[PDB]
């Protein structure tokens, strides 16, 4: 799904599988958060569904000891004095000791501030304990979390329910055409990107000898040359677009371990899971009612949330009893207008455009020499056209799919390509789509704030600030305090300060609120990047103060106030909105739940081989399931004919569904349903 999708998935703690437990065997004790999980396994990251608590992620700083247990780092305190010496402890070993919390105030030498400090003890119990009894203390405030979890800014401001979803959803982010790093970070975005392996890291130090869109060559110091080839437009396991681009220019001095070229969802070696959007926290003509989302058309005209999706289409030619399947450009009863996009072999030409129903790989098979219809025999004597013994078995484009053919892979038994027993020619056509963002596409932030796109207004309709700039995204106010995830609010505040830039007042000294603020943040440029590490980083007092520090725009005017709000103009009526609206920048990710995949329908199609009912799934072009629960709703209404129809002529009535299709196309009345073939099956199974 993304450089993080892999990462998260490469390290998972599942209690499922052989030797372990089944899903129905697991009670309520196995699933919930245990005290020993601290710094070893995350308490946040776990699935929502029936697998909840049985699947988790490994905490960041943890590691596995030679016996299969989970160790975790702690700093060693000799006697009230912190020592840089670190020892890894196991679960039961820690219980015998006593551990201090990471954020406890420490002397510049290494000593504690207060005699009594916050203390972790066996069995998840906590108490104040004198400084003489302190054995160890935590490595980091963010020690207990996982990799994806630590990437959630202001985590300690969102409830575990939505913060859970905030971690899970990042996994389903989609790689966009090009990706931007978030204005608000946590610092984890770097190490995650590097350790993903889906970026290009320089092995040995040196200088870029040559750079192209194809590959990067590095001249080392000893003389040897290593060349790094770029993955260009490759299809991932999930049809997303793994595409790498060179960061460095030719002649740059590059050291070892440095990212010289990143991949999808990466901007300058950092996890770029989304875009920085100009948000507005308000109801707007109801189009964002119940967690729906309104977008600026700017995100469609500038491809800000546009993605590339690649599909692999396959088909083969086998040896049959009536001869052998051959891949040819000659398909029975097809015009030259349909075949126009093929080459001489029967394969589509690279770069060609394909819609649904069109032909990708023309294949025909020898059909059984069964007596052709006497009514079709008669029809072949009039027009004197002799029937061919080859039936159309071509690879056509599935319903919904469309795009540009971006490559062909052909494997022939003839060209010594080693194939399975029975196969002659195998063709792989690869088709990519350039899906812009549309209605129904699921977007989300890092704080469990999900939802689908309700409406995308034209750029002018958008509620805009005083200087004319239209907001990008309009989130509804109602669905914020309920979810307790007001970290999305803090992200909006800090997000605005980061876009405008700021400068604390140094005249009359350094202010008291910005006294804990490190020197480097007392002055910031427009479009600056910052870090808010979990259980550290920004506090509400500094954020409020920074909102006062907001640098004016190009016209010399400040746009938001100390509250973080600003005055908007309704792009439709023109009049200014009566009250100040909270405006800022938020990081929004494109999730992999797109309507272009989700949508599906069916009149008639394939049917079950035994029950003679419709098949199931979009892949098999099957119809929906009208379950036991839905048959109660019908029964309650008292809609007998609707209910009967659904389970008879709409389902597995062999002779009915055919005579319904005919009654419709002739414009007559729907006939009377017969006997459900499934019921015939039951009476035979009983026998």
């Amino acid at each position: 799904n993304n450089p993080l999708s892999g990462l998260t998935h490469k390290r998972r703690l599942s209690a499922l599988g052989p030797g372990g437990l089944s899903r129905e065997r697991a009670g309520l004790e196995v699933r919930d958060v245990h005290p020993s999980h601290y710094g070893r396994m995350c308490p946040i990251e776990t699935p929502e569904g029936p697998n909840i608590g049985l699947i988790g992620s490994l905490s960041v700083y943890a590691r596995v000891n030679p016996f299969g247990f989970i160790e975790t780092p702690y700093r060693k305190v000799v006697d009230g004095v912190v020592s840089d010496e670190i020892v890894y402890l196991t679960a039961d070993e820690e219980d015998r000791h006593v551990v201090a919390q990471a954020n406890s105030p420490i002397d510049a030498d290494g000593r504690f501030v207060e005699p009594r400090v916050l203390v972790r003890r066996k069995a998840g119990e906590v108490e104040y304990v004198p400084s003489s009894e302190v054995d160890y203390m935590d490595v980091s405030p963010r020690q207990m979390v996982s990799v994806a979890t630590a990437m959630i800014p202001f985590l300690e401001h969102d409830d575990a329910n939505r913060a859970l979803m905030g971690a899970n959803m990042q996994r389903q982010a989609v790689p966009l055409v090009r990706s931007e790093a978030p204005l608000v970070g946590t610092g984890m975005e770097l190490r995650a990107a590097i350790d993903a392996g889906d970026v290009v890291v320089a092995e040995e130090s040196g200088v870029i000898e040559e750079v192209s869109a194809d590959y990067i060559t590095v001249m080392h110091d000893n003389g040897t040359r290593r060349t790094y080839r770029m993955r260009k437009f490759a299809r991932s396991n999930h049809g997303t677009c793994a595409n790498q681009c060179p960061i460095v220019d030719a002649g740059d001095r590059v050291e070892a371990g440095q990212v010289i070229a990143d991949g999808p969802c990466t901007d300058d070696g950092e996890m770029a899971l989304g875009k920085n959007l100009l948000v507005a926290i308000m109801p707007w003509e109801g189009h964002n009612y119940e967690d729906a989302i309104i977008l600026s058309n700017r995100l469609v005209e500038e491809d800000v949330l546009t993605s590339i999706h690649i599909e692999e289409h396959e088909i083969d030619a086998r040896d049959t009893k009536l001869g052998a399947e051959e891949i040819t450009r000659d398909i029975p009863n097809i015009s030259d207008e349909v075949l126009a996009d093929l080459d001489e072999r029967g394969i589509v030409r690279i770069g060609a455009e394909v819609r649904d129903g069109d032909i990708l790989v023309g294949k025909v098979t020898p059909k059984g020499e069964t007596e052709l219809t006497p009514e079709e025999r008669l029809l072949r004597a009039i027009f004197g056209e002799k029937a061919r013994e080859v039936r159309d078995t071509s690879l056509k484009v599935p319903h919904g799919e469309s795009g540009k053919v971006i490559g062909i892979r052909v494997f022939s038994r003839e060209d010594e390509d080693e194939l399975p027993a029975g196969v002659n020619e195998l063709v792989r056509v690869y088709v990519a789509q350039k899906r812009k963002i549309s209605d129904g596409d699921k977007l989300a932030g890092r704080h469990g704030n999900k939802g689908v796109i309700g409406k995308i207004l034209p750029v002018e309709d958008m509620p805009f600030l005083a200087d004319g700039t239209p907001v990008d995204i309009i989130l509804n106010t109602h669905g914020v305090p309920r979810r307790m995830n007001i970290g999305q609010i803090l992200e909006t505040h800090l997000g605005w300060c980061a876009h405008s830039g700021w400068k604390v007042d140094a005249a009359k000294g350094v202010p008291d609120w910005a006294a804990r603020l490190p020197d480097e943040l007392l002055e910031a440029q427009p479009n600056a990047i910052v870090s808010t590490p979990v259980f550290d980083g920004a506090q509400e007092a500094e954020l409020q103060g920074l909102l006062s520090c907001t640098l004016p725009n190009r016209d010399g005017d400040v746009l938001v106030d100390a509250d973080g709000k600003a005055m908007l103009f309704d792009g439709r009526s023109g009049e200014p909105f009566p009250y100040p609206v909270t405006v800022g920048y938020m990081y929004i990710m494109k999730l992999h739940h797109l309507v272009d995949d989700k949508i599906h329908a069916r009149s008639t199609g394939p049917y079950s081989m035994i029950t003679q009912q419709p098949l199931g799934g979009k892949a098999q072009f099957g119809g929906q399931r009208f379950g036991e629960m839905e048959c109660w709703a019908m029964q309650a209404y008292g809609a007998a004919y609707t209910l009967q129809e659904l389970l008879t002529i709409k389902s597995d009535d062999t002779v009915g569904r055919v005579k319904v299709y005919e009654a419709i196309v002739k414009g007559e009345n729907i006939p009377e349903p017969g006997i459900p073939e499934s019921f015939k099956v039951l009476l035979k199974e009983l026998q």
């Binding site: 700083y61 770097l190 070696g269 910031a524 500094e542």
Partner: peptide, 23 residues
């Protein structure tokens, strides 16, 4: 800065100084 190890973009950090160990 936060991670001044590889040759990365400078991401300034609100923080108590974290020098126990790199991830």
């Amino acid at each position: 800065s936060n991670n001044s190890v590889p040759g990365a973009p400078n991401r300034v950090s609100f923080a108590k100084l974290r020098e126990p160990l790199e991830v």
